[PDB]
Coordinates of C-alpha atoms and ligand atoms in Angstrom, one line a residue:
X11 CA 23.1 169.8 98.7
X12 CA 19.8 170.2 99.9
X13 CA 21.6 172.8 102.9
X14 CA 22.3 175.0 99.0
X15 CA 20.4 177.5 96.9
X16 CA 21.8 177.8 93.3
X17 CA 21.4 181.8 92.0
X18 CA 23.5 181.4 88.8
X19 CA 25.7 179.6 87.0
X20 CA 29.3 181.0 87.2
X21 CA 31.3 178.6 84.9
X22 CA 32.0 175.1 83.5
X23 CA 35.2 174.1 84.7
X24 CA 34.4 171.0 82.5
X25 CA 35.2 168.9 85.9
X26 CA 31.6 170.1 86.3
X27 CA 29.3 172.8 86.7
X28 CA 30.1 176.0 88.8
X29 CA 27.1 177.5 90.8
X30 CA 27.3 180.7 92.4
X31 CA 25.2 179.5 95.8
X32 CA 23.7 180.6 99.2
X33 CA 24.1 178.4 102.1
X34 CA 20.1 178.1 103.7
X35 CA 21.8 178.1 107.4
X36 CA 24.9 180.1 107.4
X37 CA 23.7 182.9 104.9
X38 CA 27.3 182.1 103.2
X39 CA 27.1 183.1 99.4
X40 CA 29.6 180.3 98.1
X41 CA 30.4 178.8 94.9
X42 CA 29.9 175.3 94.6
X43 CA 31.5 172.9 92.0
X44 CA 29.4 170.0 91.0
X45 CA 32.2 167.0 90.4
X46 CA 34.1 158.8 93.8
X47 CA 37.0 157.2 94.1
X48 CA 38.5 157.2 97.8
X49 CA 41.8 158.2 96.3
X50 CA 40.1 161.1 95.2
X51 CA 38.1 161.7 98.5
X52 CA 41.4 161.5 100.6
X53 CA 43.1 164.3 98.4
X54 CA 40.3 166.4 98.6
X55 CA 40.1 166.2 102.2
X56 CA 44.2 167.4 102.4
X57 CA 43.4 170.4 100.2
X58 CA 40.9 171.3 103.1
X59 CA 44.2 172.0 105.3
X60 CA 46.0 174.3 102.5
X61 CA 44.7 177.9 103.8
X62 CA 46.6 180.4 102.3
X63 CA 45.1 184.0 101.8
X64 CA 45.9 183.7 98.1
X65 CA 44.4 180.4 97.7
X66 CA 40.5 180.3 97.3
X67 CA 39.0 178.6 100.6
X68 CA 38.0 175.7 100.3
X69 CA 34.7 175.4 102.7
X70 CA 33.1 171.9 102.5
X71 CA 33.2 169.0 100.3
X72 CA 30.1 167.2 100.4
X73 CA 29.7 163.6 98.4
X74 CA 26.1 162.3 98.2
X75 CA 24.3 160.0 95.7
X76 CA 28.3 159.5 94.7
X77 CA 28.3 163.1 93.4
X78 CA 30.9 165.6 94.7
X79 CA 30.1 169.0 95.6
X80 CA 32.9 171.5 96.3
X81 CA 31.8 174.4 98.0
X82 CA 34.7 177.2 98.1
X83 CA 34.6 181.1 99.1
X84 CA 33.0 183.5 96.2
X85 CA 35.1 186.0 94.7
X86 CA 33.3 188.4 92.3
X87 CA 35.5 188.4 88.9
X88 CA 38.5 186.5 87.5
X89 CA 41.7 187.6 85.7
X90 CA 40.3 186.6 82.5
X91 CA 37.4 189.0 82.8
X92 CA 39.6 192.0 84.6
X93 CA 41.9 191.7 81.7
X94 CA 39.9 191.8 79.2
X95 CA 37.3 194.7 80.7
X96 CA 41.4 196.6 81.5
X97 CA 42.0 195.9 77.8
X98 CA 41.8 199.3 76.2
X99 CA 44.7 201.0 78.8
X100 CA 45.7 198.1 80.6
X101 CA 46.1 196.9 84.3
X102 CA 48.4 199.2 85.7
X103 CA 52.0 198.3 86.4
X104 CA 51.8 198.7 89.7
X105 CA 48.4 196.1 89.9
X106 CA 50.4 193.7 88.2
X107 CA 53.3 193.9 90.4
X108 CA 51.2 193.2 93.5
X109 CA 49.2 190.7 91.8
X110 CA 52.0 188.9 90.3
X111 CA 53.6 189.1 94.0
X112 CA 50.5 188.0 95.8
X113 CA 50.5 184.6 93.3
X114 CA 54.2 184.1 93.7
X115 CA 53.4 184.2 98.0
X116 CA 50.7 181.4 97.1
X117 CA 52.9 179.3 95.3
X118 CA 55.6 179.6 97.6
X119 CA 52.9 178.2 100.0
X120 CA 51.3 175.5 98.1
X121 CA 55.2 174.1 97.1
X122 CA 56.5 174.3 100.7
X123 CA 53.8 171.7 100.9
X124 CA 55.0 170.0 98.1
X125 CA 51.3 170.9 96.6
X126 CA 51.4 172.0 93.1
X127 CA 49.2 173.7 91.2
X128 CA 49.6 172.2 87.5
X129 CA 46.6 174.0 85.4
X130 CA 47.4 177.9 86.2
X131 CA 45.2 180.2 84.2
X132 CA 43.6 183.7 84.3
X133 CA 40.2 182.3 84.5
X134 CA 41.1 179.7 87.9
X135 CA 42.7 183.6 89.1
X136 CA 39.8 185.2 91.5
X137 CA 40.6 188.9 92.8
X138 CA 38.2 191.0 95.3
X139 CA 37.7 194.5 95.3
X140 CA 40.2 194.9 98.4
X141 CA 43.0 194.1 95.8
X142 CA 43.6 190.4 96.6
X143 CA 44.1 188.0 93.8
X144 CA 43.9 184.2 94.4
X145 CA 44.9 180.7 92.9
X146 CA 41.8 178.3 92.4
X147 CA 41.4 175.0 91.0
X148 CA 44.1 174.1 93.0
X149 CA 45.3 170.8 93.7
X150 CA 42.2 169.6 92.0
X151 CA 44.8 168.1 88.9
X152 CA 46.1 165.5 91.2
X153 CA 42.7 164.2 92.7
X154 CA 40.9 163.7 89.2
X155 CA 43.7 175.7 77.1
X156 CA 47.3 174.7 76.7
X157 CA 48.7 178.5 76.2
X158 CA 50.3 178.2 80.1
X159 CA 51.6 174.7 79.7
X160 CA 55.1 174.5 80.8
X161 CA 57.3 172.7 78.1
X162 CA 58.5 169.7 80.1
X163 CA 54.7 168.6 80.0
X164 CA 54.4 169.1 76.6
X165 CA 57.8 166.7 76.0
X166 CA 56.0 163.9 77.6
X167 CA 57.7 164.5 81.3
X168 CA 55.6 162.2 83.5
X169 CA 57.2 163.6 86.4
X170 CA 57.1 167.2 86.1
X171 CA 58.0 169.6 89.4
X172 CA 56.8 173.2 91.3
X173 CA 58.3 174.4 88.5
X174 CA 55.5 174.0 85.7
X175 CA 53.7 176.4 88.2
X176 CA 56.4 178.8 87.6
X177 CA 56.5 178.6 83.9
X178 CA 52.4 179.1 83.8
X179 CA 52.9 182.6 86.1
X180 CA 55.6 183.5 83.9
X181 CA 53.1 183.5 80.9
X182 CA 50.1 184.8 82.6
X183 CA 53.3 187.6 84.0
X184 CA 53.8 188.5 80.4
X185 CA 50.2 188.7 79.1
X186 CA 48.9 191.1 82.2
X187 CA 52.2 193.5 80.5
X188 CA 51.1 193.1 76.8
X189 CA 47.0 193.0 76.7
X190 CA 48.1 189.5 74.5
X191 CA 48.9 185.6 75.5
X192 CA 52.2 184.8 75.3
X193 CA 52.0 181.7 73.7
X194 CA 48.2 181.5 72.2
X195 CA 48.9 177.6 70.7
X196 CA 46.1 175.9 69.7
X197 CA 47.4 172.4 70.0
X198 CA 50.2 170.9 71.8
X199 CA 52.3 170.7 68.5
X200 CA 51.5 174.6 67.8
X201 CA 51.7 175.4 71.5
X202 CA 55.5 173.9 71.5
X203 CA 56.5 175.5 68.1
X204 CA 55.7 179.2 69.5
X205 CA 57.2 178.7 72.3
X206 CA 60.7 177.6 70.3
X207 CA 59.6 180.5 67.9
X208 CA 60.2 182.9 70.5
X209 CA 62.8 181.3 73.3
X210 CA 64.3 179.4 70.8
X211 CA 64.4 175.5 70.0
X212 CA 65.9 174.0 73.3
X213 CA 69.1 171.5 72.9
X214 CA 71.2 170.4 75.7
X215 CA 73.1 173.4 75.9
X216 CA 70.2 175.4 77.1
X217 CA 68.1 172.0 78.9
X218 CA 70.3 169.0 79.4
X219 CA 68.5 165.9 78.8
X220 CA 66.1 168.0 77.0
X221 CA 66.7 165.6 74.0
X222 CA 65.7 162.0 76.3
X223 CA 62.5 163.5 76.7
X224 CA 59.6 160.6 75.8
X225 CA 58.2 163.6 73.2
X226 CA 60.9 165.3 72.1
X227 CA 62.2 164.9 68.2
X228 CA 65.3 165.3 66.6
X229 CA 63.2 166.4 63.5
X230 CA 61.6 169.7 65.4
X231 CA 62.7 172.7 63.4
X232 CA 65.4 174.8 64.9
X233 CA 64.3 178.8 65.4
X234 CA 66.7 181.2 67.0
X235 CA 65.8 182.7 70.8
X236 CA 64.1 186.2 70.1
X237 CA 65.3 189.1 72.8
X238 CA 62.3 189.5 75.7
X239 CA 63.2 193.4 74.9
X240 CA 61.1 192.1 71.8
X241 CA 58.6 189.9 73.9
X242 CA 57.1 191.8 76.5
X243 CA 58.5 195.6 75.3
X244 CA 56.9 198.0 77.8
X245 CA 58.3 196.0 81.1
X246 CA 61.5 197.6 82.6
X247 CA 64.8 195.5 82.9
X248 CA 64.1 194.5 86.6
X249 CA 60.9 192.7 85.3
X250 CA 62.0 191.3 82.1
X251 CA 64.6 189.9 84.4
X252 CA 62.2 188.1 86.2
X253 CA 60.1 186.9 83.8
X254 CA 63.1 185.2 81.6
X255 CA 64.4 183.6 84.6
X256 CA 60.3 182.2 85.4
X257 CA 61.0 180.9 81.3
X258 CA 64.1 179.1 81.3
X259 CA 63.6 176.3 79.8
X260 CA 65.6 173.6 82.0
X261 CA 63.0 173.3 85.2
X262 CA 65.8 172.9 86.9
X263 CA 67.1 176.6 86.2
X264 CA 63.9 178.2 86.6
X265 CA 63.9 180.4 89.7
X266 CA 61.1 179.1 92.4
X267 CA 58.4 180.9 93.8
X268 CA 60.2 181.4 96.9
X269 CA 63.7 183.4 94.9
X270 CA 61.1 185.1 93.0
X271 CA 59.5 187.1 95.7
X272 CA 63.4 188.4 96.8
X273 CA 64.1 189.6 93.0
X274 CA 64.6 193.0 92.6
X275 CA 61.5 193.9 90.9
X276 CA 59.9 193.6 93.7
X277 CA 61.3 196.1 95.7
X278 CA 58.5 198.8 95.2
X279 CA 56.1 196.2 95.7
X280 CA 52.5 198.1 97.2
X281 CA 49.2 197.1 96.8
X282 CA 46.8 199.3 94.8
X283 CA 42.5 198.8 95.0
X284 CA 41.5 197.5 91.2
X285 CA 38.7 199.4 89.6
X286 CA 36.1 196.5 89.5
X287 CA 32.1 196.6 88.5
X288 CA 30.0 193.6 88.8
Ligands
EFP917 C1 28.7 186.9 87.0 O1 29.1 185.5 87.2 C2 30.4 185.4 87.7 C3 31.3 184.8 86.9 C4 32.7 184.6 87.3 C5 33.0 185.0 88.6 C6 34.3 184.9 89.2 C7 34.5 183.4 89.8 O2 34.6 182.5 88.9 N1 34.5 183.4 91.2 C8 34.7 182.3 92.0 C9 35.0 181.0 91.6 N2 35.2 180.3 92.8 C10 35.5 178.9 92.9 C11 36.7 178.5 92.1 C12 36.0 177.2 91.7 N3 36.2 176.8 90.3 C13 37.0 175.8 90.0 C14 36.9 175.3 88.5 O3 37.8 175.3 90.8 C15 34.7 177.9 92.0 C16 35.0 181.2 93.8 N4 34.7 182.4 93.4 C17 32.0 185.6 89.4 C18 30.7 185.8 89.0

C-alpha cells in the first residue's frame, strides 16, 4: 500500500472502504478497495483474467498485514449519481439504449465464463465521459439494497443461475425509463410483495416448481399481474418487450444476456456522449 496515495474517499461498499488513489510510480489515478482466506485469494486472482471493456479493470490485488487491497481503473461518476443529477428530464432514450446494450455485452461476457455478477446496482455502474458504462463489484459475491434482487433469491434458491443478473438489469432497465425503482422494497418480505403486486403472485403456471421453493408459502397473498403498458409507460412496445421477457419470473424463461442483445429494440442501437460534470 505504501506504492498508494489516498485523495478521497469515494464510497463504502461495506466490504470496505473505497479510496480514490494515485499510484507513486506509474502516475495511475486508481480506486482502491480496502477488503484472507486462500479460497478468497484464488477467486480474486481469476477475476484478474475477466477483461471485458464493460467490466471495470481490475489492476492489482495486493494482500499485506492480511488486509486486501483491490486496486481497479477510476471512472468519474456512477449510474446512481447520473440518474439522479438526469432526474428533472431524464437520461435520454437513446443513452439508455446504449447503456442498457453495453451492460447486456458485459454480461454476455462475464456468463460465457460461467461468471456471474449477483449484486447489480446503479451505484456498482461506472460510466466515463466517452459514453461507456461498466459493471463493478463483479464477481466479488462469490469470493466473500434488495430493490434488484431477483425473486429466486428471495424464495430461498441456493443455487440460483446468470439469470438473477438478468432480472437485476431488467430493473435497473425500467428505472433509467421512469426517473423511479421498480421495486423500492425495504425488506425481503416487502421486496417480494411488490414484485407479486406488480407481475403478479407466481404459481406453477407462470414458474413451475415455484411452489418447492425452501421460502416460498402457500399463505402469500395472491395479487393479479398489472400490464407493463402500466409499469414503465413512456417505453415503446419493442422495449417493453424486452424488459418483460428480462422479468419472467421462471429463470428458466428469462431471455439471457446473449438473446437480449439480438431483440429488436436494439436495432437502432448508437452510442450518444452523456452530459457529465465532476
Ligand atoms: C467524487 O467522488 C466520487 C464518487 C463516486 C465516483 C464513481 C466511482 O465510484 N468510480 C469508481 C469506482 N471504482 C471501483 C469500483 C470498486 N467498488 C466496488 C465496491 O467494487 C471501486 C472505479 N471507479 C467517482 C468519484
Amino acid at each position: 500500500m505504501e506504492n498508494f496515495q489516498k485523495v478521497e474517499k469515494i464510497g463504502e461498499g461495506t466490504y470496505g472502504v473505497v479510496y480514490k488513489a494515485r499510484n507513486k510510480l506509474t502516475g495511475e489515478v486508481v480506486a482502491l478497495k480496502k477488503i484472507v482466506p486462500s479460497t478468497a485469494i484464488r477467486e480474486i486472482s481469476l477475476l484478474k483474467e475477466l477483461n471485458h471493456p464493460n467490466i471495470v479493470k481490475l489492476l492489482d490485488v495486493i494482500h499485506t498485514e492480511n488486509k486486501l487491497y483491490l486496486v481497479f481503473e477510476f471512472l468519474h461518476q456512477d449510474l446512481k449519481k447520473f440518474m439522479d443529477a438526469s432526474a428533472l428530464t431524464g437520461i435520454p432514450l437513446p443513452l439508455i439504449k446504449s447503456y442498457l446494450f453495453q451492460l447486456l455485452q458485459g454480461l454476455a461476457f462475464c456468463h460465457s465464463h460461467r461468471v456471474l455478477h449477483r449484486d447489480l446496482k446503479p451505484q456498482n455502474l461506472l460510466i466515463n465521459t466517452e459514453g461507456a458504462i461498466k459493471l463493478a463489484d463483479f464477481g466479488l459475491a462469490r469470493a466473500f439494497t434488495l430493490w434488484y434482487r431477483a425473486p429466486e433469491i428471495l424464495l430461498g434458491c441456493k443455487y440460483y443461475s446468470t439469470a438473477v443478473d438478468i432480472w437485476s438489469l431488467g430493473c435497473i432497465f425500467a428505472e433509467m425509463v421512469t426517473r423511479r425503482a421498480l421495486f423500492p422494497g425495504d425488506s425481503e418480505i416487502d421486496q417480494l410483495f411488490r414484485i407479486f403486486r406488480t407481475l403478479g403472485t407466481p404459481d406453477e403456471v407462470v414458474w413451475p416448481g415455484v411452489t418447492s421453493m425452501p421460502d416460498y408459502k402457500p399463505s402469500f397473498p395472491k395479487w393479479a399481474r398489472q400490464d407493463f403498458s402500466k409499469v414503465v409507460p413512456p417505453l415503446d412496445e419493442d422495449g417493453r418487450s424486452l424488459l418483460s421477457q428480462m422479468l419472467h419470473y421462471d429463470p428458466n424463461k428469462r431471455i439471457s444476456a446473449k438473446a437480449a442483445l439480438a431483440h429488436p429494440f436494439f436495432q437502432d442501437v448508437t452510442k450518444p456522449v452523456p452530459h457529465l460534470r465532476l
